[PDB]
Amino acid sequence: VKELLEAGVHFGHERKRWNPKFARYIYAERNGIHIIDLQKTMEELERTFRFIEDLAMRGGTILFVGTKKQAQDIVRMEAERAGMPYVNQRWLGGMLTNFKTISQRVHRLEELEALFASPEIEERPKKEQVRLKHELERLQKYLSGFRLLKRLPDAIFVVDPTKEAIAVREARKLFIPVIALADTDSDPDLVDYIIPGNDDAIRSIQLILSRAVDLIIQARGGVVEPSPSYALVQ
RNA sequence: GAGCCCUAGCACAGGUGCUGCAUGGCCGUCGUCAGCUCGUGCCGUGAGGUGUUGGGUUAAGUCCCGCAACGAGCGCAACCCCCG
Ligand SMILES: [Mg+2]
Ligand SMILES: [Mg+2]
Ligand SMILES: [Mg+2]
Ligand SMILES: [Mg+2]
């Protein structure tokens, strides 16, 4: 189910904060706003999903990023709802590019997995039960979706690339294909497979980002429900 | 002419004689001041920068939140002694 499902509540977004490189994917300045030509949305979807498919059934790992305010959660849903890695709270200087080092944080996160369930089940110089169980605190918060990922992904999926630029940069540096949902905010030129959409409305992120995860599990057989995601959707 | 010890020579001893501006070691000092760095990534043609900066907080670069950085090292703290 696609087509008018998109016009559902998810077409055009921002106005007069545009990138004129995005002028190709626009329908009009109707009532002050940029409303985004959907025929070409759909157009780009086929090519993009086509890439996802092939990538997925060839057994690839996509890396999902959405640190954005109201995308935050509907990421770690569909990301985990497909066993793919995700970056949720904040992108870090050189997850990809400084990958080896940023990994020793995960290498050392699960050292503390294995100190919870431990012979030190309740022991070690008692003020070290915040000193270390608050190290695992931060480690937890950030590397929760990143922890799976043990070689660079074969792709990345991004919700707002002008928001998420520090990532996309690393991607392109590393020849890693950039998949993203992008609106009039953004610079198409450096998004390899674009979902000309709406970086913002939670429904729009949902419709799109879930289907893409359908396609992913569905390209290893075993489709499920209407997705464990409708947040407080409101 | 084994050792030892004497006098005559010999190779050497000795020197608190100079150079702390040839030096080691040890000390003083800014100063127990909250600092000085490195590894990798990143930015810059480059010297270099980021990190360490910022907002809150500490006796402290002490910790917190934030952030193209993420972590480490010598410091600080703690591990030692005395007094309750
Ligand atoms: Mg001297
Ligand atoms: Mg000297
Ligand atoms: Mg003198
Ligand atoms: Mg002198």
Swiss-Prot record:
Instruction: Tell me the superkingdom of the source.
Output: Bacteria
Q: Which InterPro entries match?
A: Ribosomal_uS2 (IPR001865), Ribosomal_uS2_bac/mit/plastid (IPR005706), Ribosomal_uS2_CS (IPR018130), Ribosomal_uS2_flav_dom_sf (IPR023591)
Alphabetic keyword roster: Coiled coil, Ribonucleoprotein, Ribosomal protein, RNA-binding, rRNA-binding
Q: Name one GO cellular component term.
A: cytosolic small ribosomal subunit
GO MF assignments:
rRNA binding; structural constituent of ribosome
User: Where are its TM segments located?
Assistant: none
Coiled-coil residues are: 98-143
Family annotation (Pfam families): Ribosomal_S2
- A biological-process GO annotation: translation
**Subunit architecture:** Part of the 30S ribosomal subunit. Contacts protein S8 and may contact the N-terminus of Era.
What is the role of this chain? Answer: Spans the head-body hinge region of the 30S subunit. Is loosely associated with the 30S subunit.
What family name appears in the similarity comment? Belongs to the universal ribosomal protein uS2 family.
**Protein known as:** Small ribosomal subunit protein uS2
Phylogenetic lineage? Bacteria, Thermotogati, Deinococcota, Deinococci, Thermales
